[PDB]
Symmetry: C3
Subunit: 622 residues, 3 copies
């Protein structure tokens, strides 16, 4: 039992009492909120040729504490808050696993109690670190996680629910030993870059105190890490031979600036086919997967050496240049708003649909409390069809759900208040070669302006890559390069996917997907600054297509007006138990609600829809 003090909060960490059969277990308590996290890792190697790691964060109360149970009454599935928290925990712990740890691993978070004051999502990240630290699963140093908010200009560590609602910043920082950063996830109300950068430095300082406390608990209880059967990494002898065979051919492919996505991959695949054939001959007894991974290591090394040595990217761009950006609005007449955003070979179609206010709340209390009503009546739906990458796939996706929330909070600060309709932005990825999620914010802002929503300002996002050269002995970063508007290959062979969105005068969202086991804080600051100048250029291009919201909504847009029905005719109009109202609203598409005993409010998505419902009302009234 080790206590950690963070300014004015307490973090009680304990182990050895509950769930003693799991490989690792821990209980993290702040105030009256307790979360127990367990870690289980199979001893046998996994058949899958990667690191199978799943994180499941389960809650029992929907609206924190207030709803008693969602699991007892509704087994229908996992909300988006549970999925998002699982992704944040997964991002914080995955980089610290050793390379080649091909073993099935599950991290489960069980919310023992919640007081409705201290949020359990932050304690769940720390619980995963403590459970993995005390376990025998091979894992690197402990990770501390805090949430930084800004209330009345002051930075608050782990703000309560009451303060979180009044905060202009919602930033979560996961830090490694030596003040490294392994996870960043923020949503801000268009705050300045200077305020945003200060909060990151404050957060990393607080996570070091948690790491010191966890290391103390690891010292008290004897922790002996297991020895895995074998770590699945290609042998240096095989990797060296692959470098001799295919360095020149791979170098020529990556120095050929005429390649597109499909031709670059085909050229690399042709080298892979030839090299793997002679690799098996040289090593007849080698693992078949070891041949595949050895080529991927050599190809990644060759790709990264060009950026570091020559400052030239595989498509001929320099470190700061953007890809070609094309914008378009008013694609189809019947849509309330539309926009087609193109960035290199990434195409995104964004649509804006207006709906009734009542569409937010559905199906009694528990269902509408599992997924709470959005603060402003505005949600974003993200789709990643299989053909976006020329693929076959079945049509709950974790990546697509997470990207939708990332783009939704990027556009959230500029959405106006008290809009007379629900705003539903649908972002569809038609072609994928880069940051389609960031293109959803740019295209979503264009479609919002085209639909007539009076947003405060345009929102643009970009992804910043990173290529580093780490010393094999010290482990420190000798030198690094930051890339603007990375491709798919640069993200695949890079060290991070630093997606950040915002307006021209502020920052609205950030999601750093760091693949390295921690990066220095100054690299994060330079990534924010590099993306600041890249965002200005993108907003310059988008403003040429459209610079301000349209004066009025489209003529074929939704209408809302009241209809008066007498007391005598209400029985016939509503029908037996509201059957007539439910029948009319189901075929003509309108939504009718009673505001009082006399007047009803009718919402029709199109003027034609209201025309049908208007004659239907009058014929009953006569």
């Amino acid at each position: 039992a080790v206590a950690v003090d963070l300014g004015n909060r307490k973090l009680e960490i304990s182990s050895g009492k509950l769930a003693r059969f799991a490989d690792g277990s821990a209980v993290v308590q702040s105030g009256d909120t307790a979360v127990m996290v367990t870690a289980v890792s199979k001893t046998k190697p996994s058949p899958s040729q990667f690191m199978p790691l799943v994180v499941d964060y389960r809650q029992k109360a929907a609206a924190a504490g207030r709803i008693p149970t969602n699991y007892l009454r509704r087994e229908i599935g996992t909300s988006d808050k549970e999925i998002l928290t699982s992704r944040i925990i997964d991002r914080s712990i995955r980089p610290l696993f050793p390379a080649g740890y091909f073993y099935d691993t599950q991290v489960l978070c069980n919310l023992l109690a919640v007081d409705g004051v201290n949020e359990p999502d932050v304690l769940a990240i720390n619980g995963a670190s403590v459970a993995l630290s005390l376990s025998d699963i091979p894992w690197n140093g402990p990770v501390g996680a805090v949430r930084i908010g800004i209330i009345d200009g002051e930075y608050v560590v782990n703000p309560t629910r009451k303060e979180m609602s009044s905060s202009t910043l919602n930033l979560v920082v996961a830090g490694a030993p030596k003040s490294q950063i392994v996870m960043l996830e923020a949503s801000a109300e268009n705050i300045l870059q200077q305020d945003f950068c200060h909060a990151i430095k404050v957060g990393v300082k607080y996570t070091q105190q948690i790491i010191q406390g966890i290391q103390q608990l690891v010292k008290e209880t004897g922790v002996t890490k297991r020895t895995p059967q074998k770590l699945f990494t290609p042998s240096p002898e095989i990797v060296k031979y692959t470098h001799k065979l295919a360095m020149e051919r791979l170098y020529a492919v990556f120095t050929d600036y005429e390649h597109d996505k499909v031709s670059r991959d085909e050229a690399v695949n042709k080298i892979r086919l030839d090299t793997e054939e002679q690799l098996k001959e040289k090593f007849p007894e080698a693992d078949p997967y070891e041949i595949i991974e050895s080529f991927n290591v050599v190809a990644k090394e060759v790709f990264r050496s060009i950026v570091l040595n020559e400052y030239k990217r595989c498509d001929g761009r320099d470190l700061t240049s953007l890809r070609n950006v094309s914008c378009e609005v008013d694609m189809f007449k019947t849509l309330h708003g539309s926009a087609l955003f193109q960035r290199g070979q990434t195409q995104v179609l964004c649509t804006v649909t207006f709906d009734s206010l009542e569409s937010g709340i559905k199906s009694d209390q528990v269902i509408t409390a599992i997924n709470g009503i959005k603060d402003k009546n505005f949600m974003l739906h993200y789709e990643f069809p299989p053909y976006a990458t020329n693929e076959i796939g079945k049509v709950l996706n974790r990546r697509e759900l997470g990207h939708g929330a990332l783009a939704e909070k990027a556009l959230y600060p500029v959405i106006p208040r008290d809009f007379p309709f629900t705003i539903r932005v649908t972002s569809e990825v038609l072609e994928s070669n880069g940051s389609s999620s960031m293109a959803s914010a740019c295209g979503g802002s264009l479609a919002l302006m085209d639909s007539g929503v009076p947003i405060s300002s345009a929102v643009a996002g970009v992804a910043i890559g990173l290529v580093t050269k780490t010393d094999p002995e010290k482990g420190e970063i000798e030198d690094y390069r930051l890339l603007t508007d990375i491709l798919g290959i640069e993200d695949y062979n890079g060290d991070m996917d630093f997606k950040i969105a915002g307006t021209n005068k502020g920052i609205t969202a950030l999601q750093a997907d760091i693949k390295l086991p921690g990066i220095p804080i100054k690299i994060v600051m330079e990534a924010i600054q590099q993306a600041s100048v890249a965002k200005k250029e993108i907003l310059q291009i988008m403003n040429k297509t459209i610079s301000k919201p349209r004066a009025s909504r489209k003529e074929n847009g939704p209408v809302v007006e009241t209809v008066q029905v007498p007391l005598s005719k209400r029985a016939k109009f509503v029908g037996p138990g509201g059957y007539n109202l439910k029948k009319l609203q189901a075929e003509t598409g309108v939504t009718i609600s009673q505001v009082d005993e006399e007047t009803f409010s009718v919402f029709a998505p199109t003027p034609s829809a209201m025309h049908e419902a208007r004659d239907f009302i009058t014929e009953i009234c006569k």
Copy 2:
């Protein structure tokens, strides 16, 4: 780009702007409705050893694009309209794929915009043809698809949404080059055969103009086709050896008229097992699947040669002869209506249940509008349990075949359903055993159970399936001669060329679903199939009328009742309860349904008079 004129309708086809990463892509626009269709096919052969093609039609908003539904995809799943459209698109494009194309193919439909006037489902079929034509996926000639309706006695191509509501016919025709019909799917309000035949002729002519427009776009684009890694067809020399080995054994089995479904299947399996081993020794290098498929080619060829040369089926009857038909009603006392229909070795148990009119609502706006409210408060649920074929399979969820077969039988029985019936009519058809057209048997059995239940339907409805066996030379590819078979068995559909299901009353046609496996068939074959099915439908209706010819004068005594109760407004607070909790509690415990009509009156629906009996007790026991 390329525009095609269809009467007063204008069609636009374009490509090269959206989804450029897919193997094929196209945008088909009619009016303000735009649909984008993509085709993706893998280059590595799939281990499934068949055609893994899957079509997923998707709509972003229900109720003619008025109520968005894309966001609740997680909590809703796929609607029935989307599944039915996917089956129609699959039927139109599957027969044109080359034989042995065992590569994972998926076709996606993305409704870019819908204006609530032009239906996007027909444009989706056309988009699938253009996307495949422009792609490098090996696919035969383009397919045009139109919808034909009959409004005020005139034939309309691609009618608007408000035009099909007043239409007596809803027919979708997919055509291949040279006026060959690929897919047929219709649902008419008991229209004459001559009117039905004329609409098909008009539709095929309209699809030819679409094909001509698509071919122009293909030539302009400059499409080149990939060379597949391998086409998994058996070697001609392997089939020649297999034919010599099992020609006589298979001939004797198919000429034995004492066989049933099970005994015939195990008889050909005995020859297959013996031939399998001998083929392996002769051709050790041959693939394990190549040996299996070669026997299937020989068995299919021997099976068809008997029909073509001798005009006799495997079970001994002639081309126009039906199998034994037996009917029975009122087997169980407590069922509102019931019927047991037997045709050959196919047995279907049909049950009729009367529910409240409020059961058609799903209590929430979006989900209710996703599938809509039934037109006559009539629905049909079709169940195909695994024991119908002596098989083991999961029963969770609803597969696409069950959904499609339920809508087909529902469309067959829809025109005769009366209007303003005081209850929701639910028909459940369970295939107890399957050897033939169970979906058509659900139409016949459903009609019998509807009359037994006491619903005053206009006329009895019967449905039959028509097979087809054609001889085609590989040199050219046109049909030389053909045989049309009445009431085909499972082996005759499996080894046949089409599954021509059609139902109707004695003086009209109500539903049709042609499932053609050939790459198009002449229109004259379709006309003959409709005529041959009308004769068989008359024979089946003759047998059914002996069991029951008119609906019962009234519903069964144990049937549902509707009553109106009076509660004073002061009493309403404690009778209804806090938030209606008392009413909801009485609903689940007893089974009755109470709906407020006005301030004092409450309408009560009880499935049984006994269930009603314990409902007035609750009303009076208060105070």
Copy 3:
């Protein structure tokens, strides 16, 4: 069409008309309720090296046939009643399958008609018996299933729905020939042990009449059984060789009394790894699984021979001794009630949370509320997370075992739940560690949490699992001698013959579920299993009573509050909003549940006093 007379009830069994393609099919009718059951078994051995038997029970309607269920999504298989009924049928027929019958088998039940008077679930078990009897699927003897209830002190066979609503006992007995018992499932209203045991005796007598009727139809029809192409029992010569190689090593492991669950398994697995790499060399031609099952046969025999000959268990306990029991209460301040029950290495955390009476139990769609309501506003949820066994599992997806265990523990605690409680009582049982009867630990832990919440229950409920190890000659098949084990471990259940989970108060029996793995056990063994469990239950209740003996005088101060607030009729339009939008919004941002009582007042349920603080300032703000 053989008819069987069971007192005043008539049972009609027919075959040969419907579903003739299936391997076996039968129709069982009682009154106006008819149930058709089919059985299909594949003739090709399954790749999975066990018996893949699945039973699916489907009802076309809910609320005893009043509400049609099909026409809806969520198929038909998944439902509270349907999953439990499938579990009852599965346990009635599973023990009678031959050993080594690794063939895919499915049993399906279709409710042809339901009259709302006779229960189709009992007919479904008999239908599964007839369908398997008439099929060519190798099955060992028909079984008969009856339901026994006590209505006015008299015992009623197959009670109607009206009689079950007034019955103090809900017992289902499945009997094999020669008066054996295959399945027991009871839900008693805290009845006396002598009355409970008499009902079992009466039930077994009635099942013998059904077996007599089924056997008449089998001979009349002329059933002939198939010959499976292979039975996967290990060869006698390999099993005897594994015995000579691992008997001494396994004997030392099971006589080592300092082993725990994990250490014992690793010690056994060490012997398995060393023995298997010697059996393969001795029999290079042996099937790979035949080696695996040969070691399992030897290990199971050695484990059972110790308790038979020495009366000593693997952990040093005697036959009637319990494991260590530890209990804690109110470990977390914010929970309405909590308890941490520990039994040996089995650890269960139980939580009690109150709910709004109305919105809690009533679902959104009144049609979708097929399991409409619990008689008392009380239900239990059982969770078996994968880390309870140090495993990785599907955290989602339907779990039949989890559903069955939740209803079993809920049945145990139901008779002591008070009536007309202001809130919906929801008990959560989470198995943090599992080494035995976590289901019965949920009964004891749930009892402690209920008293800690202030719920005035009548008495404390304790449960226990009784195992059994028998000696049976292979020449004939009778039981010579046997041992009954109190509070069995996981290994004792795995290598045992029966998992006799029974719960009750200190003066009665509330629930029972006998998981008999043998092809029937004598009525005598069941009698002493109940008596032995009575002694163990009293010992457990004394340990729990030390932690807490009576319910708290009041609920926790941070518990739910229900009180009304007056809303003027002139302000009703603005407060409720357009079509109840404002009430839905307020009830979603906060946990407060608002229900309109009359035209001027609204009843407000608040989960916490702070929740009503937020709600009160929200409504008063509207008043301006």
